[PDB]
Design a protein around this motif. Structure first.
Motif: not given
Lengths: 241, 239, 251, 238
Positions: C66-77
């Motif tokens: 539910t945390d869009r910032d955390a999800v984006a960080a994983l996708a970038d990683d």
């Protein structure tokens, strides 16, 4: 003079223009007393005043279906002033333009989900006491996009598949209280962006607005007294093609 | 309500049950009705009761599995009336047999023959009359056209076939202004535990509650509806 | 031994417990390198460490879908470290109990919609660049409740019908990029019964009274169809929701 | 070499050409012993002999699926020689061209219904004793035409919607006997009505229908019954 909704109290959301205004007029022509609400209260009141001048019973108000406090206030008012609600039509909705792989899809998704799904939930849930008291019924506005992806944006498609499911589970939980819950699933209606629909519709035409109003009135009426949990396509054959 | 005022409506299986009720309901909506049944005596008795009430009705025997007899009726309707405004394919039978039983074959042949092959016979033969009037067709489908439920294989398959027949007739007849739809009832007033355990309204539908959706689909209220199968099932398929 | 996912990188959400953990193991057994994420990072790492100990290649992380910032960080990683993603399995999901006419239905609705629908959208949308780079595919976790109301709370039924539609429209928009998008629609499987105190008496009757096989599915019987859809055996399948339900929806 | 059908006996109808021949080959490559039958017995035997020449165990016969006596004879032969049947694939099928308002639609209807639906019923019903003895499973050939009208003739559309329903009710009646019953629903197999709507913008390769058939016939699908799986490049989702 058909009188399918004679003396029934009908609440229509998004009633200030387009299909919602046409559903409001159609219900009034079938004998209903109509409460018209819209994010634009001036438009809801203008539609209601026009119905009053034509000899019908109608009133209009502003309502933001995404504001749970405002939705609850309207539900409390309806229960207090009228003792119940015979028909709820969840017509308030929006669409948008964005492909799934575009950053813009997120803003479009949030806006469309917020009105089409979360607003329909808000209004439906808040009106359960009034619907129980009258053994009323609910008609949601689904879409052919609740069955196939068609050409609409992801948030719209998902919101309408969500409404299809909402129809089923509301029907299950409210059946013991004598409340029917159904939906219509239009294609495109009068109220190459449309080629995805026009290239598949069997009738090779866009539906008249009255041709979506009539099935809504049918589902809200005793003609549909053994119909619940059901989504009725009103699509010129699109989903059968 | 005058939904079918002065429209000519043909109903098969109209000597009893839902078919007789659809015929009466169409007459009450202003239609002239042709009632046909495998029992011509029952069809004429239903038609005569409508005539006694001041409606315009007639009854005939029709075996929907007899292509010659179906063609003769279609020829008669086109010659006498010039067209047909509504066809309701209601003639149907059922049976008892599990798929792994030898009796399933006889039941299959009988049920497929009336419910599917008979509906094809009547639908195909009446196309010229439906074209002339820009009429419409309502088939009798069933919840069994969507899930297996408790019905015998021939019945389930016949109704799934009717669901598909609705779609492809709608496609091929749309250029001629002919709508084609179906109702899908549950178990009707006209064992059953598989249905009762799942139906949200916890009751069997009244015959009039299936008649009204048929009249709706046959009427201008449904003028943008084609190829569609409408459950009339108390919530069964949503459960 | 089948190697249906040989050398593919697979990301599974909700992988710290239950079906998500079992999908992660099944993918590894089919040759995949697996990234396991879970709201409980310690659980995801325990599952990943057990796969590493067994001889597989796996890693675990905390992720709040539910945390869009955390999800984006994983996708970038993932994009930076691996250059793409071969399979996304959106398994993270929750349920609840509340009838529609109860006030409690609102809090349950918000929680269930938030994880099941909005979380699946967050993860799916954020991983599109990585899926494009690999021409990967997505398997969503739908349910029989995406087709009928069954016995589930309104937020769950609606989230799963929404997932059914999300499958179709993602498939539509990602097909030009060589990305397939499908879903499984399970009935009840054994992993959902693993905590005895949470199995209310009669709580499975809605399913058991209708399922043709008259049994709860083994967790591995839901894992196998997920692997199938994620594999080249399903290379002409997209936009499709496959019931894995013992015949429930056909009844 | 996934061995998904290792040592299973598989009967494929319409196996002399096209998809049926490919399902037979794919089943052998997955470890099955295969009985290939076709209206043209020469073609069924030619396909079977080619599998035998690769070291597989295969045999071919003529079968008219519309001839109940011939279907019964094959069922009795399978029970006598093998004692059971692990997989039945009902692939025999035909199509045709006729619009509903044409007189030709009647002859086309009768021919297509006769093979696609009535033949599938004949073979399925006759092989129930053998499927029971092996706790085997059935895979029917449905179609996207079992869900929407598409571009096919009425008899074809109706035959495939009928197969969709036959899948459900066979699954219901045979589940107490441990028999799963499923179907695949391909699109057009190796046309604008299909091509303009398919998401993958291509016709599927025959191997891409074989693999889902083998999946449904295998223990990977052991909790799947009554199900119709589209193998259609996204056509039905569009």
């Amino acid at each position: 003079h058909m009188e399918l909704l004679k003396e029934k109290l009908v609440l229509v959301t998004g009633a200030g223009r387009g299909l919602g205004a046409a559903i409001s007029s159609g219900a009034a022509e079938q004998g209903a007393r109509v409460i018209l609400v819209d994010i634009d209260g001036t438009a809801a009141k203008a539609q209601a005043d026009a119905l009053t001048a034509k000899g019908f019973v109608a009133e209009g108000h502003a309502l933001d279906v995404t504001d749970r406090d405002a939705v609850a206030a309207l539900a409390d008012d309806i229960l207090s002033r009228f003792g119940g609600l015979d028909v709820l039509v969840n017509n308030a909705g929006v669409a948008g333009r964005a492909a799934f792989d575009q950053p813009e899809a997120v803003e479009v998704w949030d806006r469309v989900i917020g009105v089409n799904l979360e607003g329909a939930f808000n209004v439906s849930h808040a009106l359960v006491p009034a619907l129980k008291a009258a053994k009323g019924n609910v008609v949601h506005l689904c879409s052919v996009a609740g069955f196939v992806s068609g050409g609409s944006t992801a948030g719209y498609v998902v919101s309408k598949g969500a409404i299809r499911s909402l129809t089923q589970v509301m029907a299950r939980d409210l059946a013991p209280h004598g409340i029917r819950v159904n939906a219509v699933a239009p294609g495109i209606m009068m109220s190459g962006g449309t080629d995805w629909f026009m290239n598949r519709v069997m009738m090779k035409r866009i539906g008249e607005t009255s041709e979506v109003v009539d099935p809504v009135v049918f589902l809200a009426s005793p003609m549909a007294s053994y119909i619940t949990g059901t989504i009725l396509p009103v699509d010129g054959g699109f989903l059968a093609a």
